[PDB]
Amino acid sequence: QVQLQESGPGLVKPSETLSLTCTVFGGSITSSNHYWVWIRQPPGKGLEWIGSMYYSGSTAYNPSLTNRVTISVDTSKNQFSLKLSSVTAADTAVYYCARQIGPKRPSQVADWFDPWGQGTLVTVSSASTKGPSVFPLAPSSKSTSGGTAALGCLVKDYFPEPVTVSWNSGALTSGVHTFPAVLQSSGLYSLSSVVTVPSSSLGTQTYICNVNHKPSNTKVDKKVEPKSC
Amino acid sequence: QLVQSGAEVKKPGSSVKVSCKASRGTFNTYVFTWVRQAPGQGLEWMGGIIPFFGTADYAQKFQGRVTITADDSTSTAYMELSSLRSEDTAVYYCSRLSQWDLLPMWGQGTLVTVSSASTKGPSVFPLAPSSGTAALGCLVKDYFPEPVTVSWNSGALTSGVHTFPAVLQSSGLYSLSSVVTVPSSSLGTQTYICNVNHKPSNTKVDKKVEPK
Amino acid sequence: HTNLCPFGEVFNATRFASVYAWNRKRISNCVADYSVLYNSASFSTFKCYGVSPTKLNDLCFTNVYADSFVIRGDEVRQIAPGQTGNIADYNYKLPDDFTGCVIAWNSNNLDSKVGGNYNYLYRLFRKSNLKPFERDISTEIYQAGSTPCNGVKGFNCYFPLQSYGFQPTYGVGYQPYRVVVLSFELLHAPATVCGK
Amino acid sequence: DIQLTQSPSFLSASVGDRVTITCRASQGISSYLAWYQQKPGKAPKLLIYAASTLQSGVPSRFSGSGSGTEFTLTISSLQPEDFATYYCQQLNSYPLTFGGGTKVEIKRTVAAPSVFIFPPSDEQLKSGTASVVCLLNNFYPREAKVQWKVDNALQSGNSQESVTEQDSKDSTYSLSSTLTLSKADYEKHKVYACEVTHQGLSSPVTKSFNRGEC
Amino acid sequence: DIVMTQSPGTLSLSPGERATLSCRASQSFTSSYLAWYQQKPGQAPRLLIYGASSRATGIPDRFSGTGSGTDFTLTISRLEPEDFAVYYCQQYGTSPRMYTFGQGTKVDIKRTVAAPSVFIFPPSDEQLKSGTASVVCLLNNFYPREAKVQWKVDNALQSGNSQESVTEQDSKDSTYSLSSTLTLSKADYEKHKVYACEVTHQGLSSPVTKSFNRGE
Ligand SMILES: *[C@@H]1O[C@H](CO[C@@H]2O[C@@H](C)[C@@H](O)[C@@H](O)[C@@H]2O)[C@@H](O[C@@H]2O[C@H](CO)[C@@H](O[C@@H]3O[C@H](CO[C@H]4O[C@H](CO)[C@@H](O)[C@H](O)[C@@H]4O)[C@@H](O)[C@H](O)[C@@H]3O)[C@H](O)[C@H]2NC(C)=O)[C@H](O)[C@H]1NC(C)=O
């Protein structure tokens, strides 16, 4: 099973150069019947093909991206990269790397994408990077006798997107809702991640939210307990 | 993938002969040419030879002084430069072509130094700062051969340090200068020492720069 | 003479010509080696007709012609005397008494684009077969029906040239191949291309 | 440049309904079309290629058909996990282009929201800013109304909302409303409450706490 | 011979831009070829493009080559930091006589105009004991590389008794530094009193002079 694991900075200042890298797993990059591509999706918009590349060097770029796109391959590291210069706010998008199947015969049905990378959000902004502050959203003292209570974490004042939130190192996913971030008037993002648990477990089960913000190298593990009075 | 002979050191008026061995017997289909490059300068073509015929041509600036030969039995080309002068100090390259492709193969180059050949150490003189930021340095003068290494405060002071590439004087010796810019307040409360090491002469000089 | 024959300027051509517009190079007044051709292992196809490659270094010729073009793998077979096909009939034909050598190698790493290299063309339609060493570069609209094509493409009105796909993912029979056809003539004149 | 027009832009169908999405190309591309399924936060997933060939690992309820200019993607029995945005892609000419996408919403029975209110933590009040969060959990449909009352004074202009995408298992939504105040303004008033109205509710629901009181 | 001329002399570009270098021949390439080389400080020339439009082995695909006859071009789509060096073009041929080089083109990391900080250094009392005087003039951190130094000894412009040395472009502020050394004998040094070096640079609205009085 071929896998693609992309990496790179999620924040690029205007007029600078975007740079991302995709690492191929479970298969060699010197494939004689596949292309290595990049596809971007602006927030709330459709998909746009950026370019495709064969391991031996050849490229085909989207003419809508002028001459500011360059894809490169590192056969010795099983990697292929993307570079986009003179970036503007119109370049803020989630960038995917993917594998395109090439045709073996003239006029053969090919050129679809499988598999894809997970997607990396790159924000074009001169604004400085800020890591978030994690505040607990404690379950109410009232709650119920043996019903269900709600608790969560408040991830406030960070830039740029995104942050990732998990609960109990990934051992808590049932009933979890991580809301999309809202852009506050201060220019910084903020979101909350909540989870509904039975009220009887509030004294016998720990709940830690795992907040990760790669643009600021921030990792916060915050415990959410019932508030004491 | 040509292989040239080792570096040479010659006195003025003498001659030097540099070899260029071709990888196996690829000889005859080739034209071999010699290109030299003085330190920090560009590339200059000296001449060429067609091995299978022994026909050699030269640049008029070198005609007479340079003789290019070739031996088909050993897959080696030769360049002899006579009446050497200080201006002939350069790295000399052999390069070739191929009958059935257009591709330039180059040798690794041969350094030929034409000057009074001794092994001597440099004299280090201080460049004293003038009486918000001031400059000071050391004058590493009259040494041979290349190179020398210079550090400040034994590696502690690196910010604002400029060690210039050495120049070859008419005496045949090298001169090098290494300077550093520091705030003017620290002149009376910070000792600056340049560390000059010349391995060919086993030279280790620690010279302290003084504000007069 | 003394000068070597510029085979480096035909084999190492950064760009080769399309087979319908095959490039011909005239070789004259030079010492033609022949060791490194038959000694280089880059070539996928090396077949000589009318003469032997070993007995070629010690033989004189008045002129030597170097014809070079690009086709696909399964069409390399047609670069030989007495062959038939789209290339042999409409693009490049060798005579039945051909005296020379055909040299071909896979150039997929050079003549393929990930969007498909559509610069190499071949003639698909022609009213008659090419006779030996003929070069046809006309782009006249092929009238395949009664209706006179008024120079406009359409129904029963073709463009006579078709484009190779040439994508690096193509099968070996459809990947690009660069071909060099060395023909040796011995006219009634002192000779200029001999060798070794 | 080949342009792909995808109709409709949005659609909402019930579980078990038969859904049909149309992709119309600006020119005839024979059968050089592929379909993709993109769930929220995930990369697009290949469903159909060559207009009608199903990708290994896709439920049989998905199917594609069409030739030339018009193509259709059909989900014979819509499931809750099928909430996604579906894209078509021409694979005939460069540059490679996608359609605009068809966002498919699930229509289920009405579900009233569970309401919770969270006071600002003592750790945040130390920073000088107070955030009061109100949670509306697992409700359908998406439309909901949240009013903030501070000492029975309706607030406006100091609250932002955020709605999760449709859940892939029960097809519900969740909403969070954050009331941002200064530490000084937070300590001036006492009763904080968010009033919720949603189709599944039958009288408005108000969750409230008293500042400082346990 | 065939004269090969390159342009521009210095190509001042920011990392990430597209570089364009020209190579002109005195006569149309009848039976000649063309290659492009890259040379970094203290290294041998490295082949980039040959046959006008053939990428050598290992050279990145951002390096391109075009041209025909008398005019040729070396195009770098996106300039990388490892690409800031000197570039040469050489024409070759089947025979030996052809080979000629161009004068080279320096591709440096572009910057705003920066005027040099000028310092002058009298000869140390230790060197005066040796019978030779060396006066040094430092031009610190400037851009572009082009600079002019003139030595004046009691208002007498010096010539033929000075040598210069220029550092590589700095990896942090992208500026150059120059060192010029005036060499006089100890006898000739004490016959004059005022020693100064006049610096002319694009960043200076007028030539700056830094002097010292022999003694004080
Ligand atoms: C134009 O011609 C050049 C040069 O052709 C070479 O010489 C002729 C006479 C024939 O012998 C060819 O087979 C030779 O290649 C061609 O460039 C070559 O391209 C190939 C790829 O197709 C390159 O292969 C690489 O080789 C690397 C290591 O090479 C080692 O051996 C060579 C001996 O040739 C030696 O020079 C080198 O120092 C190494 O020791 C290897 O790391 C890499 O992965 C790859 O395999 C080859 O290197 C190129 N030649 C040279 C000398 O580098 C062009 O392909 C040709 N173009 C056309 C259109 O024909």
Coordinates of N, CA and C in Angstrom, one line a residue, chain A residues 35 39 41 45-49 52 60 62-63 96 100 107-114 116-118 134-141 148-152 154 156 175 177-185 192 194 196 222 227 229, chain D residues 1 31-32 34 36 38 41-46 49-50 55 87 89-92 94-100 116-119 121-124 127 129 131 133 135-138 160-164 167 172 174-176 178 180 214:
Chain A
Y35 N 2.9 9.3 -12.2 CA 3.4 10.7 -12.0 C 3.2 11.1 -10.6
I39 N -1.8 19.2 -5.8 CA -3.1 19.8 -6.0 C -3.5 20.6 -4.8
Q41 N -6.4 23.4 -2.8 CA -7.8 23.7 -2.6 C -7.9 24.9 -1.7
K45 N -13.3 26.5 -1.5 CA -13.3 26.5 -3.0 C -13.1 25.1 -3.5
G46 N -13.0 25.0 -4.8 CA -12.8 23.7 -5.4 C -11.3 23.3 -5.5
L47 N -11.0 22.3 -6.3 CA -9.7 21.8 -6.5 C -9.0 22.4 -7.7
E48 N -7.7 22.6 -7.6 CA -6.9 23.1 -8.7 C -5.7 22.3 -8.9
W49 N -5.5 21.8 -10.1 CA -4.3 21.0 -10.4 C -3.1 21.9 -10.6
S52 N 2.4 18.0 -12.5 CA 2.7 16.6 -12.5 C 4.2 16.4 -12.9
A60 N 4.9 19.0 -16.1 CA 3.9 19.8 -16.8 C 3.1 20.6 -15.7
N62 N 0.4 23.8 -14.5 CA -0.8 24.5 -14.9 C -0.5 25.9 -15.5
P63 N -0.9 26.2 -16.7 CA -0.6 27.6 -17.2 C -1.2 28.7 -16.4
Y96 N -2.2 19.4 -1.4 CA -2.1 18.0 -1.4 C -1.0 17.5 -2.4
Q100 N -0.4 10.3 -9.6 CA -1.2 10.2 -10.8 C -0.8 9.0 -11.6
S107 N -3.8 7.2 -26.1 CA -5.2 7.3 -26.0 C -5.7 6.2 -25.0
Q108 N -5.0 6.0 -23.9 CA -5.4 5.1 -22.8 C -6.0 5.9 -21.7
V109 N -7.0 5.4 -21.1 CA -7.7 6.1 -20.0 C -6.8 6.0 -18.7
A110 N -6.3 7.2 -18.3 CA -5.4 7.3 -17.1 C -5.6 8.6 -16.4
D111 N -4.5 9.1 -15.8 CA -4.5 10.5 -15.3 C -5.5 10.8 -14.2
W112 N -5.8 9.8 -13.4 CA -6.5 10.0 -12.1 C -5.5 9.9 -10.9
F113 N -6.0 10.4 -9.8 CA -5.1 10.5 -8.6 C -5.5 9.5 -7.5
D114 N -4.5 8.7 -7.1 CA -4.6 7.7 -6.1 C -3.3 7.2 -5.7
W116 N -3.6 10.0 -2.1 CA -3.4 11.4 -1.8 C -2.6 11.6 -0.4
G117 N -1.9 12.7 -0.3 CA -1.4 13.1 1.0 C -2.6 13.6 1.9
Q118 N -2.2 13.8 3.2 CA -3.3 14.2 4.1 C -3.7 15.7 3.9
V134 N -4.4 27.2 26.2 CA -5.4 26.1 26.3 C -6.0 26.3 27.7
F135 N -7.3 26.6 27.7 CA -8.1 26.7 28.9 C -9.1 25.6 29.0
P136 N -9.4 25.0 30.2 CA -10.3 23.9 30.3 C -11.8 24.4 30.3
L137 N -12.6 23.6 29.7 CA -14.1 23.8 29.8 C -14.6 22.7 30.7
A138 N -14.7 23.0 32.0 CA -15.0 22.0 33.0 C -16.5 21.6 32.9
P139 N -16.8 20.3 33.2 CA -18.2 19.9 33.3 C -18.9 20.6 34.5
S140 N -20.1 20.9 34.3 CA -20.9 21.6 35.3 C -21.0 20.8 36.5
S141 N -21.0 21.4 37.7 CA -21.1 20.7 39.0 C -22.5 20.1 39.1
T148 N -25.4 12.1 31.1 CA -24.3 12.5 30.3 C -23.9 13.9 30.5
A149 N -22.6 14.2 30.8 CA -22.1 15.5 30.9 C -21.2 15.9 29.8
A150 N -20.8 17.2 29.7 CA -20.0 17.7 28.6 C -18.8 18.4 29.2
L151 N -17.7 18.2 28.5 CA -16.4 18.9 28.9 C -15.6 19.2 27.6
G152 N -14.7 20.1 27.7 CA -13.8 20.4 26.6 C -12.7 21.3 26.9
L154 N -10.6 25.0 25.5 CA -10.7 26.2 24.7 C -9.3 26.6 24.2
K156 N -7.4 29.2 22.3 CA -7.6 30.6 22.0 C -6.3 31.3 21.6
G175 N -17.9 10.7 20.6 CA -18.6 11.9 21.1 C -17.8 13.2 21.1
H177 N -16.3 16.5 19.5 CA -16.5 17.5 18.5 C -15.5 18.6 18.6
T178 N -14.6 18.7 17.6 CA -13.6 19.8 17.5 C -14.2 20.8 16.5
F179 N -14.6 22.0 16.9 CA -15.2 22.9 16.1 C -14.2 23.7 15.2
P180 N -14.6 24.0 14.0 CA -13.8 24.8 13.1 C -13.4 26.2 13.8
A181 N -12.2 26.6 13.6 CA -11.7 27.8 14.2 C -12.5 29.0 13.6
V182 N -12.7 30.0 14.5 CA -13.2 31.3 14.1 C -12.1 32.4 14.2
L183 N -12.1 33.3 13.2 CA -11.1 34.4 13.2 C -11.6 35.5 14.0
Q184 N -11.1 35.7 15.2 CA -11.5 36.8 16.1 C -11.1 38.2 15.5
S185 N -11.7 39.2 16.0 CA -11.4 40.6 15.6 C -10.0 41.0 15.8
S192 N -12.8 25.6 20.0 CA -13.1 24.7 21.2 C -13.3 23.3 20.7
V194 N -14.8 19.7 22.2 CA -15.7 19.2 23.3 C -15.9 17.7 23.2
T196 N -18.7 14.5 25.0 CA -19.8 14.2 25.9 C -19.4 12.8 26.5
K222 N -3.6 19.4 28.4 CA -4.4 20.1 29.5 C -5.4 19.1 30.1
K227 N -14.8 21.3 38.4 CA -14.3 22.4 39.2 C -14.6 22.2 40.7
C229 N -15.0 23.7 44.6 CA -15.6 25.0 45.2 C -15.3 25.0 46.7
Chain D
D1 N -8.8 25.0 -22.7 CA -9.0 24.6 -21.3 C -10.4 24.0 -21.2
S31 N -15.0 9.0 -22.6 CA -15.2 8.5 -21.2 C -14.0 8.8 -20.3
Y32 N -13.4 9.9 -20.6 CA -12.2 10.3 -19.8 C -12.7 11.2 -18.6
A34 N -13.4 10.9 -14.1 CA -13.3 10.3 -12.8 C -14.1 11.0 -11.8
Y36 N -14.7 11.8 -7.5 CA -14.0 11.8 -6.2 C -15.0 12.1 -5.1
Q38 N -15.0 13.8 -1.2 CA -14.2 14.5 -0.3 C -15.0 14.7 1.0
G41 N -12.3 17.8 6.1 CA -11.0 17.6 6.7 C -10.1 16.5 6.1
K42 N -10.7 15.8 5.1 CA -10.0 14.7 4.4 C -9.6 15.0 3.0
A43 N -8.6 14.3 2.5 CA -8.3 14.4 1.1 C -9.4 13.8 0.2
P44 N -9.6 14.2 -1.0 CA -10.5 13.5 -1.9 C -10.2 12.1 -2.1
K45 N -11.2 11.2 -2.2 CA -11.0 9.8 -2.3 C -11.6 9.4 -3.7
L46 N -10.8 8.6 -4.4 CA -11.2 8.1 -5.8 C -12.4 7.2 -5.7
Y49 N -13.5 5.8 -12.0 CA -12.6 6.2 -13.1 C -13.1 5.6 -14.4
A50 N -12.7 6.2 -15.5 CA -13.2 5.8 -16.9 C -14.7 5.9 -16.9
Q55 N -13.8 1.9 -8.4 CA -12.5 1.7 -7.8 C -12.6 0.6 -6.7
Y87 N -16.6 15.5 -6.4 CA -16.0 16.2 -7.6 C -15.8 15.3 -8.7
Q89 N -13.7 14.9 -12.5 CA -12.4 15.3 -13.1 C -12.2 14.7 -14.5
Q90 N -11.9 15.6 -15.4 CA -11.6 15.2 -16.8 C -10.2 14.7 -16.9
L91 N -9.9 13.6 -17.6 CA -8.6 13.0 -17.7 C -8.2 12.8 -19.2
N92 N -8.6 13.8 -20.0 CA -8.3 13.7 -21.4 C -7.3 14.7 -21.9
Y94 N -4.7 18.4 -21.1 CA -4.0 19.2 -20.1 C -4.4 20.7 -20.4
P95 N -4.5 21.5 -19.3 CA -4.3 21.2 -17.9 C -5.5 20.3 -17.3
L96 N -5.1 19.5 -16.3 CA -6.2 18.7 -15.7 C -7.1 19.6 -14.8
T97 N -8.4 19.4 -15.0 CA -9.4 20.3 -14.3 C -10.4 19.5 -13.6
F98 N -11.0 20.1 -12.6 CA -12.0 19.5 -11.8 C -13.3 20.2 -11.9
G99 N -14.4 19.6 -11.5 CA -15.7 20.3 -11.4 C -15.8 21.2 -10.2
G100 N -16.9 21.9 -10.1 CA -17.1 22.7 -8.9 C -17.5 22.0 -7.6
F116 N -25.3 23.1 26.7 CA -24.4 23.2 27.9 C -23.8 24.6 27.9
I117 N -23.4 25.1 29.1 CA -22.8 26.4 29.2 C -21.6 26.3 30.1
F118 N -20.5 26.9 29.7 CA -19.2 26.8 30.4 C -18.7 28.2 30.8
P119 N -18.5 28.4 32.1 CA -17.9 29.7 32.6 C -16.5 29.8 32.1
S121 N -12.7 29.9 32.7 CA -11.8 29.3 33.7 C -11.1 30.4 34.5
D122 N -10.8 30.0 35.7 CA -10.0 31.0 36.5 C -8.6 31.2 35.9
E123 N -8.1 30.3 35.1 CA -6.8 30.5 34.5 C -6.9 31.6 33.4
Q124 N -8.1 31.7 32.7 CA -8.3 32.7 31.7 C -8.6 34.1 32.3
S127 N -5.8 36.2 32.7 CA -5.2 36.9 31.5 C -5.9 38.2 31.2
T129 N -9.1 38.5 30.0 CA -10.1 38.2 29.0 C -11.0 37.1 29.5
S131 N -14.0 34.3 28.4 CA -14.7 33.6 27.3 C -15.8 32.7 27.9
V133 N -18.6 29.9 26.8 CA -18.9 29.0 25.7 C -20.2 28.4 26.0
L135 N -22.7 25.4 24.2 CA -22.6 24.2 23.3 C -24.0 23.7 23.0
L136 N -24.2 23.6 21.7 CA -25.4 22.9 21.2 C -25.0 21.6 20.5
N137 N -25.4 20.5 21.1 CA -24.8 19.2 20.7 C -25.8 18.3 20.0
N138 N -25.3 17.7 18.9 CA -26.0 16.7 18.2 C -27.5 17.0 17.9
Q160 N -19.3 34.9 18.6 CA -19.1 34.2 17.4 C -19.5 32.8 17.5
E161 N -20.0 32.2 16.4 CA -20.5 30.8 16.3 C -19.6 30.0 15.4
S162 N -19.7 28.7 15.6 CA -19.0 27.7 14.8 C -19.7 26.4 14.8
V163 N -20.0 25.9 13.6 CA -20.8 24.7 13.4 C -19.9 23.6 12.8
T164 N -20.0 22.4 13.4 CA -19.3 21.3 12.8 C -20.0 20.8 11.5
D167 N -22.2 15.0 11.1 CA -21.5 13.8 11.6 C -21.8 12.6 10.7
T172 N -26.0 14.4 12.6 CA -26.4 15.6 13.3 C -25.3 16.7 13.2
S174 N -23.3 20.1 15.4 CA -23.0 20.7 16.7 C -22.6 22.1 16.5
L175 N -23.0 23.0 17.5 CA -22.7 24.4 17.4 C -22.1 24.9 18.7
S176 N -21.1 25.8 18.6 CA -20.5 26.4 19.8 C -20.6 27.9 19.6
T178 N -19.3 31.5 21.5 CA -18.4 32.0 22.4 C -18.7 33.5 22.7
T180 N -17.2 36.7 24.2 CA -16.0 37.3 24.6 C -16.2 38.6 25.4
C214 N -20.9 28.5 42.9 CA -20.6 27.1 42.4 C -21.6 26.5 41.5

